[PDB]
Design a protein around this ligand. Structure first.
Ligand SMILES: [Mg+2]
Length: 166
């Protein structure tokens, strides 16, 4: 069983992950990123992000062909660019199936799977596939989600995990 430190160490950074995508997938990521960058974050979110003083690691299982990865990882990368204390490293879906599924008591790996770790690699919580507001909204919210209307929420969900951990 690889440690979280070992898995984080072999994960790719976001730029390298995007760089292995098909051009169409790279374009999708660029545009979700531009949407978040032009629309900006709500001031309360910017505040929450500014309060992160300790280092946190996001161990992510994801793939560039997955729309849910394109969307939510564009958002989480934006957060790491605004707050260097947060760092993402990305491993494959297959690797999460081989080395995380049983450890996490998951039936299958739905991507992106985002494990929020502290500086000691303690597991603080998880973001799984889509933000809570999208899960809550159901089928009728998918359209707005697939269009990027819940990018800030991916960031908010991860921040709540960090904030909830005292
Ligand atoms: Mg690099």
């Amino acid at each position: 069983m690889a440690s979280y430190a070992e898995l984080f160490d072999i994960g790719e950074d976001f730029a390298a992950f995007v760089g292995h995508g098909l051009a169409t997938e790279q374009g999708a990521v660029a545009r979700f990123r531009q949407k978040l960058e032009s629309n900006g974050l709500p001031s309360a979110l910017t505040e929450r992000l500014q309060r992160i003083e300790r280092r946190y690691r996001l161990l992510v299982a994801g793939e560039m062909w997955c729309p849910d990865c394109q969307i939510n990882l564009a958002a989480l990368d934006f957060a790491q660019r605004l707050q260097p204390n947060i760092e993402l490293a990305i491993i494959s879906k297959g690797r999460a199936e081989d080395d995380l599924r049983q450890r996490l008591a998951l039936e299958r790996i739905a991507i992106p799977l985002v494990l929020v770790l502290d500086e000691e690699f303690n597991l603080l919580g998880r973001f799984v596939e889509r933000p809570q507001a999208v899960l809550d909204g159901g089928p009728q919210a998918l359209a707005a989600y697939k269009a990027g209307d819940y990018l800030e929420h991916a960031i908010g969900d991860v921040l709540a995990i960090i904030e909830g951990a005292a």
